[PDB]
Request: fold
Amino acid sequence: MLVLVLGDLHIPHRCNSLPAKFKKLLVPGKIQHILCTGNLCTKESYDYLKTLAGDVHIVRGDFDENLNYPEQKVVTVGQFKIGLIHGHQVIPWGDMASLALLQRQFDVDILISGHTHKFEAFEHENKFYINPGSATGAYNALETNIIPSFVLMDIQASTVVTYVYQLIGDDVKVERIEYKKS
Ligand SMILES: [Zn+2]
Ligand SMILES: [Zn+2]
Ligand SMILES: [Zn+2]
Ligand SMILES: [Zn+2]
Reply:
C-alpha cells in the first residue's frame, strides 16, 4: 500500500502550480494515502490532492488559514505509526506540558515534518525520519536554490521503501531507501 508524502507547496504564492514534470507521476488511483505537511495555501491544491487519493491527511502549518487541519496527526498505515507535523512549531523547551504531548509525536516509527523545504530522509534507532521538502521547490526566508521534491512510500509488512523524487534541472532523479523495522 502506497503513500504520497509531500507538502510545502505554497500555491499560489511561492510558485504558480506544481512542476509539470511532477504532476506527470501523480496519477489518480495509484496512491492509497496522502500525508501532507501543510502549506498548500489554497483550496485549489487540497482538491488536486483529493483527486490522487481519497485518504488525505493534512496538518496545519505556519499561517495555514484552515482550522479543521490538526496541528499534529499520528496516522497508522499498515503496522507503521507515522507522525506528521508541519514542522515550524518549534516547541519552547521549558514548557514541560507542551513537551509531554510530544512524546506522542516521538513515539512513532516514521516521523514526517516539513517547513524547512530542504528535503531529508533517514533511519535512526529503528525509526524513520522524513522531510519531503517542497513539492513545488518553493523558496523560504533563507535561500532560493531549492530542489522540488516529494516522497512516495511503499509500505508492506514491516518494510518501507521510500522514493524521493526531486527535480534537478531537466531530469527527475529518484533516490530509493529501504527502511526496515525490526
Ligand atoms: Zn513552506
Ligand atoms: Zn504560502
Ligand atoms: Zn489514513
Ligand atoms: Zn512552513
